[PDB]
Design an enzyme around this catalytic site. Structure first.
Site: not given
Ligand code: B7E
Length: 377
Positions: A37, A223
């Protein structure tokens, strides 16, 4: 305002459930699958027998575990997680041949955090200390990795998609077989999220003609932990209007564009050619210089194989009140280099991206774009 050619294909996942890497924590090592992440900064792992988890971190079995005597309660949009802070030895089997002492948040309670049916048990927050919970004194994993070893301060991601998905996280370098053409770099505006500046947006080469601050209101980030291409409300509205107009040969309900319903075509059809290409121009390395990244409908029209009532798709471009989020729909078209050492992010056409005989994802430049500094909010 552990060579690179052993790191290729080290990521796995399922559609919409993110990409994960195998990691080991503690002594003796405990194997866990961890979500990669770039949109967060904590190394947080399930540490209790949640019924959805295949495995979890058992601190009592680790001789190298150290308690930080501090808890953390993390609310977010979609749920929450609560953890107990500590440190332990961490390694990446299909990564560099190193062992580091990193901060680990042992997750003891959560809500809408873990996915029912997923194969990951933790999250590897690859962003910067500024957004670490509870504060910036909790050193993120990658910062510990570079400080304790000779691993270069860089990582790259090739997210391939497809159902089982796969990819590569090259830790400490770049593998030139993962991309075609040249890498083009955009500066990291601020070291918190991987913040970038979008300077222009085009739908099938047609400029949206908006004030460029709107594209970065209140930020634009890269992201890996977000599926969609998320856009600020005003930008989403203009982009959808343009996409509707470009694809006007076939009419779709309003709910489809809002992600409220799926659109289905016959078992082997799908008119990819009626849907336009989407281009994002990113601030370049030089004054008044930019480059553009281009994605296809194969990236933003996601197939839904879970349908139990035809080949059904979800429109994966959505509105956001937190700014632009370049999620998996952007990242799956490109090989993305998180060049932390040079405060920049590199983009190159991915050697694994899904395309057709007529169109391909593209990274092109240089272009002259004036007033780029004015695009930042
Ligand atoms: C430090 O606490 C972070 C931890 C991380 C998330 C929580 C989360 C859970 C699952 C997935 C998730 C699910 N399916 C697929 N992919 C990812 C993502 C997140 C977040 C939200 O957005 C991003 N980037 N990370 C945000 C949270 C503030």
């Amino acid at each position: 305002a552990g060579s690179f050619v052993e790191m290729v294909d080290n990521l796995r996942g399922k559609s919409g459930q993110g990409y994960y890497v195998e990691m080991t924590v503690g002594s003796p090592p405990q194997t866990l699958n961890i979500l990669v992440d770039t949109g967060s900064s904590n190394f947080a792992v399930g540490a209790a027998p949640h019924p959805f988890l295949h495995r979890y971190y058992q601190r009592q079995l680790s001789s190298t575990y150290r308690d930080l005597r501090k808890g953390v309660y993390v609310p977010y949009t979609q749920g929450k997680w609560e953890g107990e802070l500590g440190t332990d030895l961490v390694s990446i089997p299909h990564g560099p041949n190193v062992t580091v002492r990193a901060n680990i948040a042992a997750i003891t309670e959560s809500d809408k955090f873990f996915i029912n049916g997923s194969n990951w048990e933790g999250i590897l927050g690859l962003a910067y200390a500024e957004i670490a919970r509870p504060d910036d004194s909790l050193e993120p994993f990658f910062d510990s990795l570079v400080k304790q070893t000779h691993v270069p301060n860089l990582f790259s991601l090739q997210l391939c998609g497809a159902a089982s998905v796969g990819g590569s996280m090259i830790i400490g370098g770049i593998d030139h077989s993962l991309y075609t053409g040249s890498l083009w770099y955009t500066p990291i505006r601020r070291e918190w999220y991987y913040e970038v500046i979008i300077v222009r947006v085009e739908i099938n080469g047609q400029d949206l003609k908006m004030d460029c601050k709107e594209y970065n209101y209140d930020k634009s980030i890269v992201d890996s932990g977000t599926t969609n291409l998320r856009l600020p409300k005003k930008v989403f509205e203009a982009a959808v209007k343009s996409i509707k107009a470009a694809s006007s040969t076939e009419k779709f309900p309003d709910g489809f564009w809002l992600g409220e319903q799926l659109v289905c075509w016959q078992a082997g059809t799908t008119p990819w050619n009626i849907f336009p290409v989407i281009s994002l121009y990113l601030m370049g390395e030089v004054t008044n210089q930019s480059f553009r990244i281009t994605i296809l409908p194969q990236q933003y029209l996601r197939p839904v194989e879970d349908v139990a009532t035809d080949d059904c798709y979800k429109f994966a471009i959505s509105q956001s009140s937190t700014g632009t989020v370049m999620g998996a729909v952007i990242m799956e078209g490109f090989y993305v280099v998180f060049d932390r050492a040079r405060k920049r992010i590199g983009f190159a056409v991915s050697a694994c991206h899904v395309h057709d005989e007529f169109r391909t994802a593209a990274v092109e430049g240089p272009f002259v774009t004036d007033l780029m500094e004015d695009c930042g909010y």
